[PDB]
Ligand binder design. Structure first.
Ligand SMILES: Nc1nc2c(ncn2[C@@H]2O[C@H](COP(=O)(O)OP(=O)(O)O)[C@@H](O)[C@H]2O)c(=O)[nH]1
Ligand SMILES: [Mg+2]
Length: 184
């Protein structure tokens, strides 16, 4: 008896350092295409249809960025948010350090009781030889899975998930978990 069931409307906001793949993740989820050439700064106004656990959900995808108008305006995205995707890049230890230093304080300031899914994107670079050589110059290496899980535990995230927007692996699962968190 599923036809004629009213949809549940939820709002998702995605935040994180520039270039970690926030917009690419939204486009892969929304359009099943990894944007290869002309990716905008933000992917705005989209509302995704997603069914999880027999509930039909309309999930508004709010993209954010970090420069000029986007930085001063970003706090305007937070009202009435039902779930947060907080993204770092596995090829960027610095983007992980900003999770506790910047993103968690900001999100806890504007969205105090909203569930946070911590997302490690670009997991395809974990074994990319060029990535390893560039990070090795800095005595660094790609973020390890246990390092992401540990950060998720520290910030009290609803969960930790790893993605490659590029291969699309894990992307669907992130938004499904985020929809469940939103239904709380
Ligand atoms: N290898 C790889 N590159 C990615 C991935 N996700 C995004 N990118 C690239 O990372 C850069 C930033 O992407 P964008 O989606 O613009 O990041 P945003 O600034 O967080 O919105 C672009 O060059 C994307 O093609 C991923 O999973 N793997
Ligand atoms: Mg973007």
């Amino acid at each position: 008896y599923f036809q004629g069931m009213a949809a549940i409307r939820k709002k998702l906001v995605i935040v994180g350092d520039g270039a970690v793949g926030k917009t690419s993740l939204l486009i892969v989820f929304s359009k099943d295409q990894f944007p290869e050439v002309y990716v905008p700064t933000v992917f705005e106004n989209y509302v995704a249809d997603i069914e999880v656990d027999g509930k039909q959900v309309e999930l508004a995808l709010w993209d954010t960025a970090g420069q000029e108008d986007y930085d001063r305006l970003r706090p305007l995205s937070y009202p009435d948010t039902d779930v947060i995707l907080m993204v770092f890049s596995i090829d960027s230890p610095d983007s992980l350090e900003n999770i506790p230093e910047k993103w968690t304080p900001e999100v806890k300031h504007f969205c105090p009781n909203v569930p946070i899914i911590l997302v490690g994107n670009k997991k395809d670079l974990r074994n990319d030889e060029h990535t390893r050589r560039e990070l090795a110059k800095m005595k660094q290496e790609p973020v390890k899975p246990e390092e992401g899980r540990d950060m998720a535990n520290r910030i009290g995230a609803f969960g930790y998930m790893e993605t490659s927007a590029k291969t699309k692996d894990g992307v669907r699962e992130v938004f499904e978990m985020a929809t469940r968190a939103a239904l709380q």
